[PDB]
Design a protein around this ligand. Structure first.
Ligand SMILES: CCC(=O)N(c1ccccc1)C1CCN(CCc2ccccc2)CC1
Lengths: 213, 221
C-alpha cells in the first residue's frame, strides 16, 4: 500500500485567473513526482517532472512545486486550452502510483444553444426504424432540458441524449438527443419537434418539421 | 519525430487472452523503457510495468502478475503486452508510453491507447446513417450536418470527416447505451451553407472489433 491523493476532484476557474491543485504523498518522495494533463479521448501528456520543472514545450503557465510530501501544480493565467483532468504521480518507489485526478472546469458567460433538428434518412427507414436527432450546439452552462413532442404530445421513454466535454476553444458544451421509433409508428404522426429550455433562452425554443416534408 | 502506434480495439471472451502491440518509430528503440498504463474511467490511472527493449528486463506492478506479460521485438521496434485471465471487470483502455531524456531535458511520448472490452456477447458492426443538412439545421449562414452511427458493440468507433481533412467544428458525441445493449453515436460538423453545392462531406466510420469500415457521403435534403 502506497498512495497519492488529490483533495479536489473538481476545480472551477475563469479564464485569466490562477488556480492550483493539491497532491499529498503518503511517504517522502522528494523530487520524484510527475504531473500530467489529460483531455477526453486523448492520451495523458506530462507537464512537470522532478516535481518542480516542466517538460519541453510545456508553457510557463504551469509551475510545479513541493517538498518531500506536499505537492502543488499551479496554473497561472488559465486558458480554455487548459481544460483537462490533471494527475500527480510518484516515481520514487515501486509500484508507481497516480493520484485520483482533478478536472478543471471553465466558468464563462451564458451562451444560448443553436438548435438544429434532423429527420430520419431514407436508408434507415428501409430498415424498418426511424431516428430523429435534435442538436444543441455550443451553449453554456451545461444545464439544458430537451423535450420531444410528436403531434404536440410530450414523449418519454423513447429517446436518449449525450453531452460533449467542455470545448477547448470556446468552453461551451453541445448536446445530441435521438428520438427512436419504429417506421410504423413514425408514419402514424405528422409533426416532429424538440423543445429546448436553457438559461440563455428567455423562452423555450422549438425546432420542428412535418413528416413528408 | 517520435511516434508510438498502438493496435486496434479488442473484444475478448471472459477468461481468455489478447496481445496488444505498441510500434515505436523515430528513435533508438533499444535505449529507453517502454512503460504501460491502464485507465478505467470508473477507477483512474494505474501503472502496469516497464520493459527495457535493449536486454528485455522488466519490472511489473505486483497487482498484474498473471494478468499482463511484457515483451519486445527489437527487430521490428515493437513492444507487446499479453493480457490473460481477463474478467468482465478488466475492461479498460491500455496506453504504452516512453520518455527520452537528453541532458536532463525530458520529453514523453504516448500511444493513442487501446480499448479492451471483456464480454461474452458477439460483436456487431454499426449502421451509418446521414444527418442531412437542410433549412432545419441552419443558423446565421452556417449549416449543421452529420452522421448517426447506430447499433454497434463493443465500443469504440472512430469517426473522422473527409479522411481527416475536416476537423474544425466537429463534435463527435459520447456514445449512448441502448436497451438492446448496443451503442449508438452522433458525429456532427458545422460548415458554411453557401458552399454546400461544391464541397463533399463524408464521415469515415471504423469499428475494429467487427472489421467494419464505412465512408458515408452526407448530401443535403
Ligand atoms: C508511469 C510512467 C512514469 O512514471 N514515467 C514515465 C512517463 C512517461 C513515459 C515514460 C515514463 C516517469 C516520468 C518522469 N521521469 C522522470 C525522469 C527524470 C528525472 C530527473 C531528471 C530528468 C528526468 C521518470 C519516468
Amino acid at each position: 500500500d502506497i498512495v497519492m491523493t488529490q483533495s479536489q476532484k473538481f476545480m472551477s476557474t475563469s479564464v485569466g485567473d490562477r488556480v492550483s491543485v493539491t497532491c499529498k504523498a503518503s511517504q517522502n518522495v522528494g523530487t520524484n513526482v510527475a504531473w500530467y494533463q489529460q483531455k477526453p479521448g486523448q492520451s495523458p501528456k506530462a507537464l512537470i517532472y522532478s516535481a518542480s520543472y516542466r517538460y519541453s514545450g510545456v508553457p510557463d503557465r504551469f509551475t510545479g512545486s513541493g517538498s518531500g510530501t506536499d505537492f502543488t501544480l499551479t496554473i497561472s493565467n488559465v486558458q480554455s486550452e487548459d481544460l483537462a483532468e490533471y494527475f500527480c504521480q510518484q516515481y520514487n518507489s515501486y509500484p508507481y502510483t497516480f493520484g485520483g485526478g482533478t478536472k478543471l472546469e471553465i466558468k464563462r458567460t451564458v451562451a444560448a444553444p443553436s438548435v438544429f433538428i434532423f429527420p430520419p434518412s431514407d436508408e434507415q427507414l428501409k430498415s424498418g426504424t426511424a431516428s430523429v436527432v435534435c442538436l444543441l450546439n455550443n451553449f453554456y452552462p451545461r444545464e439544458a432540458k430537451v423535450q420531444w413532442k410528436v403531434d404536440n404530445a410530450l414523449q418519454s421513454g423513447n429517446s436518449q441524449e449525450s453531452v460533449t466535454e467542455q470545448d477547448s476553444k470556446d468552453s461551451t458544451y453541445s448536446l445530441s438527443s435521438t428520438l427512436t421509433l419504429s417506421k410504423a409508428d413514425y408514419e402514424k404522426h405528422k409533426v416532429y419537434a424538440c423543445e429546448v429550455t436553457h438559461q440563455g433562452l428567455s423562452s423555450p425554443v422549438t425546432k420542428s418539421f412535418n413528416r413528408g416534408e | 519525430q517520435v511516434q508510438l502506434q498502438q493496435s486496434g480495439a479488442e473484444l475478448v471472451k471472459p477468461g481468455a487472452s489478447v496481445k496488444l502491440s505498441c510500434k515505436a518509430s523515430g528513435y533508438t528503440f533499444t535505449n529507453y523503457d517502454i512503460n504501460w498504463v491502464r485507465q478505467r474511467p470508473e477507477q483512474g490511472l494505474e501503472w502496469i510495468g516497464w520493459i527495457f527493449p535493449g536486454d528485455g528486463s522488466t519490472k511489473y506492478n505486483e497487482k498484474f502478475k498473471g494478468k499482463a506479460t511484457l515483451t519486445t521485438d527489437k527487430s521490428s521496434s515493437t513492444a507487446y503486452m499479453q493480457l490473460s485471465r481477463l474478467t468482465s471487470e478488466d475492461s479498460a483502455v491500455f496506453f504504452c508510453a516512453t520518455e527520452l531524456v537528453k541532458d536532463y531535458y525530458a520529453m514523453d511520448y504516448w500511444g493513442q491507447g487501446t480499448s479492451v472490452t471483456v464480454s461474452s456477447a458477439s460483436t456487431k458492426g454499426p449502421s451509418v446513417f446521414p444527418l442531412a443538412p437542410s433549412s432545419k439545421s441552419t443558423s446565421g449562414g452556417t449549416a449543421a450536418l452529420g452522421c448517426l452511427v447506430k447499433d454497434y458493440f463493443p465500443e469504440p468507433v472512430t469517426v473522422s470527416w473527409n479522411s481527416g481533412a475536416l476537423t474544425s467544428g466537429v463534435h463527435t458525441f459520447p456514445a449512448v447505451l441502448q436497451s438492446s445493449g448496443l451503442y449508438s453515436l452522433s458525429s456532427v460538423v458545422t460548415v458554411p451553407s453557401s458552399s454546400l453545392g461544391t464541397q463533399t462531406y463524408i464521415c469515415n466510420v471504423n469499428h475494429k472489433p467487427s472489421n467494419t469500415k464505412v465512408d458515408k457521403r452526407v448530401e443535403p435534403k
